[PDB]
């Protein structure tokens, strides 16, 4: 209840409510040491809310503070003048770039590629051509660094600002700096390129099943020596493929050390290193002594990646320990106890009270692919977009199937050509009411009432007045295609079911289950599975009704079986219900099941299968 607030060793965590809004309004809105001059003046927070959908109330400390709490680009939204030259456009078409710094969360092959993929995002729509150089100064210096990385624009520990890049110009012009305290990944959690055993090349498959417990990070369970291994697919018991997880404390690569582990500390020219360095190197490769005196014995190996169970905090990666006591209570799972920012931590010893040794349970991390994408545009001259679906949008949003947005193609092509040696991006971001909209799916997902479309969902609880949005559907569900159809959630198990094309997805707890997305065949319907029209649950029968075509369907959400010979047409139970309704929804209580088609809905009564209330979709739901 009176939720306790604690300071974790290493984290400096004052920032109460507003306190932050102060430190977080001048970074991207210019307003220094003084508490913003909104006192006798009124500006600042306003333009903040201009950006990001206009819920302009003023400080709106209740709903707005959650937006400066989201992971974003390190770049400002206003004043393009922040050192990069006035004219934001390369005077050339052949542009070099060089990877100076890397990151331990990823093997340098993955990073190398990750970037190159980012650049391509821009090339594929421009006569621009990026070629990497390994020596001297290039047009883009790619590096990683922590607070105070050398340019005067510091980063803020884990989370928060993700990276930043200067617009085209001299030396620093175009450089891309990514935050080293982040957990870089390909988007969906920690990544680890395995080292030995029977799958030497593969990526660790997290999670994976062993001994009846899911593992999401490399482990030493099983082993006795202390080494780290991870299975290379979901089912270890069936597949049997795995490899060892890199760790300078465990082994190294190449060099002349024969795999031997780093020695700490190791002297190199009057300095004792306690971890690998790049000291002496320009390929940005971490290396290290394998003996206590690198100079004398001249023994060494490389450190291409470091696996870790825990992130941040003060346990250097040490795995969690369960159960653990904290503030007097034992916890057998990661908690947010002691945290006000929701971040999830755990203890690295059975008792935090006595040891104060903790870490962060690794979340999903941030895709170097994507973060570099946005960044690179910046470096091509581009500036922060106000279009939720725009790559060049400040806030971070993980999309499995990422596509540049017209908005982007527009901005970038506007400066450069389009395609040497006529196509377009296609769709744009739908607007609330302004124009006619046939939603792809309306649904009661949790408490909110989501409205779907191509890549966007607007949603609201009770307010008919006006929903929220738009927001990328991939915010909550990434593996979902860019145009879903029918969608529902089983109130018998609280599972979000999504229909689309020839397949269907069924999320639960923000993650799709192993096996899905299966076709509709194994679902229940005949091979008609080409596509669907609408679906929902009963407010009194508590079953599923899959409407598709002139004929509706039935499903046992209370059993696995199927009902005798459907498809039968609406010729029986359903009445006014028109051919192929865009959507169907059942709300809390009432007993009414709204049916959607065209630009208007049709109220249906469960208590009595008859009819009611014919209303304008736009005016009634989806607030206008």
């Amino acid at each position: 209840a009176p939720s306790p607030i604690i300071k974790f060793p290493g984290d400096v965590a004052p920032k109460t409510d507003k306190e932050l809004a102060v430190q977080y309004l001048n970074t991207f809105y210019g307003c220094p040491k003084e508490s913003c001059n909104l006192f006798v003046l009124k500006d600042t927070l306003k333009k903040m809310q201009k950006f990001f959908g206009l819920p302009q109330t003023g400080d709106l400390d209740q709903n707005t503070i959650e937006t400066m709490r989201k992971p974003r680009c390190g770049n400002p939204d206003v004043a393009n003048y922040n050192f990069f030259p006035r004219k934001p456009k390369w005077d050339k078409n052949q542009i070099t770039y060089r990877i100076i710094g890397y990151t331990p969360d990823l093997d340098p092959e993955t990073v190398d590629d990750a970037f190159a993929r980012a650049f391509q995002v821009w090339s594929d729509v421009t006569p621009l051509r990026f070629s990497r150089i390994h020596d001297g100064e290039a047009d883009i210096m790619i590096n990683f660094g922590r607070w105070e990385h050398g340019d005067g624009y510091p980063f803020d520990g884990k989370d928060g600002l993700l990276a930043h890049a200067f617009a085209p110009g001299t030396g620093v012009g175009g450089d891309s700096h990514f935050d080293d305290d982040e957990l870089w990944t390909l988007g969906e959690g920690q990544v680890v390129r395995v080292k030995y055993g029977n799958a030497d090349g593969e990526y660790c498959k997290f999670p994976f099943l062993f001994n009846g417990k899911e593992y999401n990070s490399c482990t030493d369970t099983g082993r006795s020596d202390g080494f780290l291994w991870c299975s290379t697919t979901y089912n270890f018991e069936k597949d049997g493929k795995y490899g060892f997880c890199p760790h300078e404390a465990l082994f190294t690569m190449g060099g002349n050390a024969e795999g031997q582990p780093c020695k700490f500390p190791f002297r190199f020219q009057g300095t004792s290193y306690d971890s690998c360095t790049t000291e002496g190197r320009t390929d940005g490769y971490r290396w290290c002594g394998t003996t206590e005196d690198y100079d004398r014995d001249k023994k060494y190996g490389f450190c291409p990646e470091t696996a870790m169970s825990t992130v941040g905090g003060n346990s250097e990666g040490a795995p969690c320990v369960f159960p653990f006591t904290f503030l007097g209570n034992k916890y057998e799972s990661c908690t947010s106890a002691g945290r006000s920012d929701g971040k999830m931590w755990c203890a690295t010893t059975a008792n935090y009270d006595d040891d104060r040794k903790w870490g962060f349970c690794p979340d999903q991390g941030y895709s170097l692919f994507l973060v570099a994408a946005h960044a690179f545009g910046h470096a091509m001259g581009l500036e922060h977009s106000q279009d939720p679906g725009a790559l060049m949008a400040p806030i971070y949003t993980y999309t499995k199937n990422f596509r540049l947005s017209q908005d982007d193609i527009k901005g970038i092509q506007e400066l450069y050509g389009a395609s040497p040696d006529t196509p377009t991006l296609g769709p744009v971001t739908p607007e609330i009411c302004k124009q006619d909209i046939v939603f792809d799916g309306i649904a009661q997902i949790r408490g909110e009432i989501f409205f779907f479309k191509d890549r966007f969902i607007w949603r609201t609880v009770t307010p008919r007045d006006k929903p929220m949005g738009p927001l990328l559907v991939a915010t909550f569900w990434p593996e979902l295609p860019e145009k879903i159809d029918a969608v529902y959630e089983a109130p018998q198990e609280e599972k979000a079911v999504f229909f689309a094309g020839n397949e269907y997805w069924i999320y639960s707890a923000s993650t799709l289950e192993r096996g899905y997305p299966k076709p509709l065949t194994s679902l229940g319907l005949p091979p008609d599975v080409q596509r669907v029209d609408a679906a929902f649950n009963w407010s009194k029968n508590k079953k599923t009704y899959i409407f598709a075509g002139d004929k509706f369907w039935r499903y046992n959400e209370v059993k696995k079986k199927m009902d005798p010979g459907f498809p039968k047409l609406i010729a029986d139970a359903w009445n006014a219900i028109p051919d192929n309704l865009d959507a169907v929804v059942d709300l809390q209580g009432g007993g009414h099941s709204y049916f959607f088609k065209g630009a208007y809905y049709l109220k249906l009564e469960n208590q009595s299968l008859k009819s009611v209330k014919f209303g304008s979709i736009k005016s009634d739901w989806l607030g206008c």
């Binding site: 029968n541 039935r554 009902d563 005798p564 039968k568 047409l569 609406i570 010729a571 029986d572 139970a573 009445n575 006014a576 028109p578 065209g598 208007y600 009595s608 299968l609 008859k610 009819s611 009611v612 209330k613 014919f614 209303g615 304008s616 005016s619 009634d620």
Partner: protein, 192 residues
């Protein structure tokens, strides 16, 4: 002639007699008289009735209609050989009046569903009303009312709900629409 809107069901309900007749030789509108004095003018049709739908037995031999379209022109053709179900006001011995204002359409207009509603369908929902929806948003209170909103979907009389719909009467005394030839059930279920 300013005729109010109605669903092709009410027609078969409010109309005395309904049948498909045709004009062989128009009974040339003959004499009459009235207030100003001058003779009453009235069109008259020589007709051949295929079958009868509802109405009294004294089969219609000739159709009649107000003089001018202005008042109610049900000017139809002869020779041609088109059919018209037109359920005008039944008058003694083959006499029935057709006011432009009446449910009147060439046989070919009606859909596969509209025709088949002549024998049993429409005839089942007369103890029922058929509300016409003014403006989205509209409602229905009574358990016997059925919301009819073609003005919404298709401004004109001929519209989905008229082309394919019929507001039958429920077994509780209430009413509701339909589409097909199967009246027997509430909501699809299985034995649990």
């Amino acid at each position: 002639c300013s005729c109010s809107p109605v669903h092709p069901q009410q027609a078969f309900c409010n109309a005395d007699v309904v049948i498909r007749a045709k004009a062989v030789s128009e009974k040339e509108v003959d004499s009459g008289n009235d207030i100003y004095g001058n003779p009453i003018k009235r069109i008259q049709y020589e007709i051949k009735q295929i079958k009868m739908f509802k109405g009294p037995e004294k089969d219609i031999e000739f159709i009649y209609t107000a003089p001018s379209s202005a008042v109610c022109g049900v000017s139809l053709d002869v020779g041609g050989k088109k059919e018209y179900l037109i359920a005008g006001k039944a008058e003694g011995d083959g006499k029935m009046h057709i006011t432009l204002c009446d449910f009147i359409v060439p046989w070919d207009t009606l859909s596969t569903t509209q025709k088949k509603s002549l024998n049993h369908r429409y005839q089942m929902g007369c103890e029922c009303k058929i509300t016409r929806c003014p403006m989205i948003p509209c409602y229905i209170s009574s358990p016997d009312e059925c919301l009819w909103m073609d003005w919404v979907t298709e401004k004109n009389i001929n519209g989905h709900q008229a082309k394919f719909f019929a507001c039958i009467k429920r077994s509780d005394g209430s009413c509701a629409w339909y589409r097909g030839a199967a009246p027997p059930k509430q909501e699809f279920l299985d034995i649990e």
